[PDB]
Structure formats: C-alpha cells, structure tokens
Amino acid sequence: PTFYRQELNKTIWEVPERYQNLSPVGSGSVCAAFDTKTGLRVAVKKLSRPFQSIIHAKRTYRELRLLKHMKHENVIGLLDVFTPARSLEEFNDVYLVTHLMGADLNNIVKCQKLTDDHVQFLIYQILRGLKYIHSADIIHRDLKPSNLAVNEDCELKILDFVATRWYRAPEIMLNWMHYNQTVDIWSVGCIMAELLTGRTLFPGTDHIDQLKLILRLVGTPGAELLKKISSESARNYIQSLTQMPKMNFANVFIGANPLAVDLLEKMLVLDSDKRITAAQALAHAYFAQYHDPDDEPVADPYDQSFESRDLLIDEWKSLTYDEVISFVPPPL
Numbered sequence: 142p143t144f145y146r147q148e149l150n151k152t153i154w155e156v157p158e159r160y161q162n163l164s165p166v167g168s169g170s171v172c173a174a175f176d177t178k179t180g181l182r183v184a185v186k187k188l189s190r191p192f193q194s195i196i197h198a199k200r201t202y203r204e205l206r207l208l209k210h211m212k213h214e215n216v217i218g219l220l221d222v223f224t225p226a227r228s229l230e231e232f233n234d235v236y237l238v239t240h241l242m243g244a245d246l247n248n249i250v251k252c253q254k255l256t257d258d259h260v261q262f263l264i265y266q267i268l269r270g271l272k273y274i275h276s277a278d279i280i281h282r283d284l285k286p287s288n289l290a291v292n293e294d295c296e297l298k299i300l301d302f303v304a305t306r307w308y309r310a311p312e313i314m315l316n317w318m319h320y321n322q323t324v325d326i327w328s329v330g331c332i333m334a335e336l337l338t339g340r341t342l343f344p345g346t347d348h349i350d351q352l353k354l355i356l357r358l359v360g361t362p363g364a365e366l367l368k369k370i371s372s373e374s375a376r377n378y379i380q381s382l383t384q385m386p387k388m389n390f391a392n393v394f395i396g397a398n399p400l401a402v403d404l405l406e407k408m409l410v411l412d413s414d415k416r417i418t419a420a421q422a423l424a425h426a427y428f429a430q431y432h433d434p435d436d437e438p439v440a441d442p443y444d445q446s447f448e449s450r451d452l453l454i455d456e457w458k459s460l461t462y463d464e465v466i467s468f469v470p471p472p473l
C-alpha cells in the first residue's frame with residue numbers, strides 16, 4: 142500500500158491511499174476520513190508518542206490488544222490498524238481505524254429531551270455491551286456520556302476516549318483495591334438517571350463532595366456493609382458522617398417509569414456485592430421490549446497475562462508491531 146502525507150493541525154499524518162478527505166475531529170489525535178475500499182466514513186486515531194516511555198508503550202500495546210479483541214455491535218471495533226513503517230527498526234507511529242459515529246451521548250442529553258422509550262433502547266445497548274466486555278474479564282472504569290457514541294438511529298457503541306468522578310462508583314472514590322465489574326453498573330445508573338431528568342445526578346466538586354451527594358440519596362451504609370470495609374480510616378470517616386436516611390427513588394425520579402425507578406434502585410447500591418450485574422439487568426422487566434438472551438453474546442476469552450509483566454520499551458514496541466502485522470480486517 143502506498144502512503145501520502147499532509148499536516149492537519151500541528152500533527153502530520155501518513156495514511157494509505159484508501160483513506161481520503163481527512164478532517165480533524167478532536168484530541169492521541171482523531172481524524173474523520175472516507176475509506177475508498179469499504180465506502181465507510183471512518184475515524185482515524187493517531188497515537189501520540191506511542192513509545193515515549195514504558196508507560197506509553199505498555200498503554201499502546203494494551204489498547205491495540207483490546208481493540209483487536211472487541212467484536213460486538215455495541216462495542217467499538219477495529220476496522221484497520223496501519224503504520225508507515227516497513228520494519229521494526231522504523232516503527233514509531235500507530236494508527237487506529239474505526240467506524241465514524243454521529244455523535245456522543247453527551248451532546249444528545251444536553252441538546253435533546255429523551256422519551257422513556259429512547260432511554261430503554263440506549264441503556265439496553267450499554268448493558269448489552271457491558272455484558273460482552275465483562276465476560277472477557279475487562280472493566281471499563283471510565284463510563285460516562287462522552288465515552289458512548291450514538292448514531293442518528295440511536296445505535297450505541299461503547300468506547301474509551303464532563304467530570305469522570307460524577308459517574309465513578311463510590312468504592313473507586315474511596316480507593317478500594319478489590320472492586321468488581323459492577324463499578325460500571327453504578328456508572329450506568331448515573332447515566333440512566335441523567336437521561337431521565339436532564340440533570341447530572343451527582344455533580345460533585347471533589348471526591349469528598351461527591352460522596353456527600355451520593356449518601357444524600359442512598360443513605361448511610363448499613364451494618365452489613367460496614368462489616369465488609371477493611372480500611373479503618375474509611376470505616377471511621379463513614380461512622381463520622383451524620384446518619385442520612387435512604388431516599389425513596391420514586392420521590393426523586395418523579396414521573397418516571399416505575400420499572401425505571403426499580404432498576405435504578407438495583408444499580409445505585411453502595412454494597413457492590415449486592416449491586417445488579419450487566420446480565421441480570423438485561424433480564425429486568427424494564428427492557429422487556431428489547432431483551433433476548435439468544436442475542437446477547439459473550440466474548441471470546443481474553444489473555445491479560447501481559448499486565449503482570451515488566452518489559453523494556455523496545456519489547457513492548459516489538460509486541461505492538463507483531464499485533465499490527467498480524468491484524469486481519471473484518472469482512473464487509
């Protein structure tokens with residue numbers, strides 16, 4: 142494949158001839174383009190200094206390994222990955238190609254009002270994607286409206302591109318080091334609550350103000366949850382806050398679907414051991430119009446053994462180069 146060059150907002154791009162009409166989108170740096178081989182509008186992300194440090198190199202390998210493995214309708218997939226290099230000695234740029242979506246859920250929630258029917262379809266697609274992601278032993282940790290891309294037909298894709306702490310599970314705020322996958326479910330509840338009211342549910346100014354807003358809704362942790370908190374520092378700070386009662390969500394999300402209020406009651410739970418999972422939430426009556434267990438697939442098992450390895454930069458670079466060369470595009 143022959144490459145061409147052009148500068149687009151300080152960053153120079155070397156892309157194959159198949160990608161035309163490059164247009165800057167945001168900032169790695171992303172460009173919108175047209176793929177003459179497939180006829181699709183695509184998004185091309187150029188990784189910025191992929192091997193500047195051990196942190197960058199392993200991060201580069203992690204993202205390429207993740208995107209190559211994601212093959213689900215509601216999760217961002219990899220259409221192509223290329224580099225202008227002809228060998229490992231000159232391998233310094235990595236480009237990632239995916240579908241071009243219309244916008245993100247952040248634009249829709251602040252520019253449009255969503256019917257309860259639209260909330261069902263949008264939240265169902267998130268939970269459908271989360272079940273696929275969680276089945277591969279992967280936690281997103283960064284779910285928020287700006288990480289969810291939506292088309293004009295309300296088709297949604299999860300990606301990992303508005304404060305993140307507003308959607309962070311409380312066990313992440315207190316820096317618990319043994320949380321589970323339901324930290325994403327807490328984020329879904331905060332997102333679902335925002336689609337129903339148009340307001341951010343927990344607009345905290347800091348980590349402490351975030352927990353104060355959370356406790357005003359969910360109430361004081363009970364004796365069962367207090368038994369399972371290992372940090373004496375956090376366990377004492379929780380016992381230092383005045384006893385807040387748990388608000389009834391029907392009095393908070395008024396005029397909302399009774400099934401929507403019940404699902405939020407199962408998602409916005411402090412005790413992560415009792416928080417509803419992605420698979421269980423798909424079976425909730427709120428998604429009866431869309432739920433189909435035979436069309437909610439799980440993922441092929443994903444090898445994360447590299448995360449426990451301590452390698453050099455050129456070793457991470459060489460491993461990334463192998464994944465670039467071994468990539469097989471999906472058929473049309």
Ligand SMILES: Cc1ccc(-n2nc(C(C)(C)C)cc2NC(=O)Nc2ccc(OCCN3CCOCC3)c3ccccc23)cc1
Nearest residue numbers: 171184186200204207237239240241242290299300301302
């Ligand atoms: C270190 C690291 C590790 C993993 C990730 N990671 N994790 C995920 C999962 C969890 C959802 C599978 C996905 C990602 N990576 C991404 O979501 N990467 C991307 C974000 C935004 C983009 O372009 C946004 C612009 N948008 C594209 C499509 O919609 C229209 C415009 C991208 C464009 C092309 C290629 C990748 C993009 C990210 C970083």
Ligand SMILES: Nc1ccc2c(NCc3cc(CC4CC4)co3)nc(-c3ccccc3)nc2c1
Nearest residue numbers: 311312315317352369370371372375411412413
């Ligand atoms: N088995 C479980 C189940 C839930 C746990 C958990 N849940 C999240 C949480 C929420 C809160 C409420 C704080 C706002 C006051 C405290 O912890 N935190 C923590 C935790 C929090 C801080 C430090 C160490 C552990 N451990 C949990 C163990």
